[PDB]
Amino acid sequence: TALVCDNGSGLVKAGFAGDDAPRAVFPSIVGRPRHQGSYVGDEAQSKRGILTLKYPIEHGIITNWDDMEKIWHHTFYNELRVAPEEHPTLLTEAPLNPKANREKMTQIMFETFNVPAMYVAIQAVLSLYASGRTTGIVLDSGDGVTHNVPIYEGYALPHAIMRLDLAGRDLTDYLMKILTERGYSFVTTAEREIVRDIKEKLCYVALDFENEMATAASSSSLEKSYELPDGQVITIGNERFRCPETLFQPSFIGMESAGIHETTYNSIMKCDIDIRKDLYANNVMSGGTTMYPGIADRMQKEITALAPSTMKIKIIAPPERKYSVWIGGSILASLSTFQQMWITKQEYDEAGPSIVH
């Protein structure tokens, strides 16, 4: 049985092909000490007070291979409890992953973990597959990175890919900051995980930011309360929608980038004029940070205002978005027609890292 490992900028989602959900999900964090002369995932977040935390995949691309090798080891042995030697392994990569990087992942899988076969697929493409499409444009917003990825007949169009270094983790930090400014304190681990939970539970995307501000200014109807496990009650109203509003207005956190509606449109306009109508009718959202209530409606509205007045625009937000990359891998790796697409260790031993391309 093949393995599916989605190497997330914030969370590893790993599991077995043909399953409907990952078995393991844990932070892609490696932690170490230092104040008076290595751990992974949860036990790195857990007792971290004696740890400096690092993201080896901070923005979707793997930048530290020793730490990544630790993550993968944790994944195989500690989370899935499998012998890597026994399972074909499908790995995910970010859009615009450099060739040497994909070569490096391939070598590690064969020469370190001795997998019998492997494959590397683009996350956004897997999400599109998961929704039953091979043409469309994906907005993938995860933990450390957001991409727009137009895909035609199963192929991501590299020159049209957009990247925004703003996603779930930044929205968490932003909510923390604005709550801190109001006088609340979050120093520990959960706090700050409590702030993450507040974000997930109470935040939403306004259909019209200014109108929602007016509503929050003139009534108490958007106020919501969250109880902290010591007695503190934090109440928030406009911060519920101001926080994810950052995705559409990155200036909220001092970033000069265009927002996710503008990058979606710019991505489409980089594509062959002949496929744009198919991209506009197939905007698929994926990733945890697209889970906000209202985000599809807002994207429908913003893309409509940017696109030609006639254009048919559809946003598809699958209920399972949060794991659709992983699920796309699960489907892909179980398909009969995929089984000769595996790179075998024999194919590898005969040609080296360059086979993946």
Binding site: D19, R133, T134, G154, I327, I331
Partner: peptide
Amino acid sequence: KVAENLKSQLEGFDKSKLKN
């Protein structure tokens, strides 16, 4: 451009069949 039978399997896949 992905092979045709693969596209067909992807586009027509029935997400039941996925083990719980």
